[PDB]
Amino acid sequence: MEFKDFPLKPEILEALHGRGLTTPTPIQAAALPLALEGKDLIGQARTGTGKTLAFALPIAERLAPSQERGRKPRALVLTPTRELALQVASELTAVAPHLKVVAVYGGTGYGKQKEALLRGADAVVATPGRALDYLRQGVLDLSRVEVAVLDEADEMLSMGFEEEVEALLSATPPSRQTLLFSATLPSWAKRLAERYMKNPVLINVIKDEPVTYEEEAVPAPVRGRLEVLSDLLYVASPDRAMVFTRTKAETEEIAQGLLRLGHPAQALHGDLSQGERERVLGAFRQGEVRVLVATDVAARGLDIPQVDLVVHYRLPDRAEAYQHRSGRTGRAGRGGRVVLLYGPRERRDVEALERAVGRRFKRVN
Ligand SMILES: Nc1ncnc2c1ncn2[C@@H]1O[C@H](COP(=O)(O)O)[C@@H](O)[C@H]1O
Ligand code: NA
Ligand code: NA
Structure with missing residues (x-):
């Protein structure tokens, strides 16, 4: 109609x-x-x-x-x-x-x-x-x-x-x-x-929602990637940010690294109890935590708040995973931003992602 x-x-x-x-x-x-x-x-x-x-x-x-x-x-x-x-x-x-x-x-x-x-x-x-x-x-x-x-x-x-x-x-x-x-x-x-x-x-x-966020594929080395992430977070200064990685161990290492560098960051992984997970997401919603470092498994659910910046610290395996991660960005009338960090090796991995998604990412050249 x-x-x-x-x-x-x-x-x-x-x-x-x-x-x-x-x-x-x-x-x-x-x-x-x-x-x-x-x-x-x-x-x-x-x-x-x-x-x-x-x-x-x-x-x-x-x-x-x-x-x-x-x-x-x-x-x-x-x-x-x-x-x-x-x-x-x-x-x-x-x-x-x-x-x-x-x-x-x-x-x-x-x-x-x-x-x-x-x-x-x-x-x-x-x-x-x-x-x-x-x-x-x-x-x-x-x-x-x-x-x-x-x-x-x-x-x-x-x-x-x-x-x-x-x-x-x-x-x-x-x-x-x-x-x-x-x-x-x-x-x-x-x-x-x-x-x-x-x-x-x-x-x-x-x-059934249009893609509203800005996407940027950012070339970044594997070595010292944490500092690259931290500087990006300070420069962008998002009110809330979510950083996605592959394993539970990584979420811990990264959250702790970001905390050491001055970010209110916490890990969200599948091994936390409901008490632990509730407290983390609650602190995130309240602003006590401003960066959530999460696995794909742990971020499945309706209990995850929208953010201003999603960072792919490791590339997603599939387009489904890419969209599930990236859809968390955008709140309060703002479209939000998504950054994909990718190493010297992963050019075709990104291209395959773009193909699967049916959308080209902006290259930071
Ligand atoms: N029926 C429509 N057709 C085309 N664009 C629309 C329609 N309704 C809202 N918009 C636009 O979609 C954007 C998103 O609106 P909102 O989700 O309310 O922030 C705004 O720029 C609106 O002007
Ligand atoms: Na009418
Ligand atoms: Na949207």
Whole structure:
């Protein structure tokens, strides 16, 4: 079905078509029928899936225009970062020209956002900390919210916003539509689905997502590869990074090496107990650990957070392994980056990978 085939108001369709948007992405095609009818859903998606429009369109269609001075918002979208709040606010503004969208975030003054809220708003796109400040001030009123969106729930959890998110949702009416989007579903997300949502349908598009990350094949010697990795990590300065290697022993050697060189790194391998694995992934999610060095076996699962950089320390054996590793990159609206380290010997190994993947990697020449 094209967008014109969905039940959308004439102005909304015209806005889509003006931007050359005609055909829903998979998450949009699956979510729209439920979302347009005000039902709750969990959208398990990563990068470049079009999840923003999957909630912006229902907000646009469900909310009628209002010119009431000082009006309270009827939609709340919560995002983990200022960067994402700005991108989402921008998209919602273009999808719904009839709604006043207000972006709310910290790092700046309180004055301009306060004035905008007081003037009247239809939708608020906010980081949870600043939204909560305005709520307690009495500036942001959420009693008329009809749609609440949690965009990247697992990352809000990682930024320490869990209690803020729950407070904000509790300030909205219980008849609200709730839409939750997240790459992973940790315990806190499942608690939300249970206590803050109404039997949401889960739609998981992980297996049908476009490649959004930058890929670079980097020639690197076997000897002293650790220093090469460490310098790359300092230069790139990712908030979270995952480094893949072949064996358990390697994950230990590398994690310990990176720790010695100043990186908060930990090994993730198959011989850890569930306690050990839970603590590692928990520390990773929380930011206490920022580099995870893992084997392919240990990284299988839904409990692994998205990262900003994936490094292939050894080459993957197969295209399947390459994609499983590399798909972990990209969070918070950013496409992320993948680096394949390869030695003097492995040129054809890389070419075979490219052939199998059906995609050429950028050569650092
Ligand atoms: N139906 C669509 N057709 C083509 N591109 C889209 C569509 N929906 C969203 N996009 C774009 O896909 C990118 C990824 O969106 P998101 O996954 O929401 O960050 C953004 O640049 C969107 O503008
Ligand atoms: Na239509
Ligand atoms: Na992607």
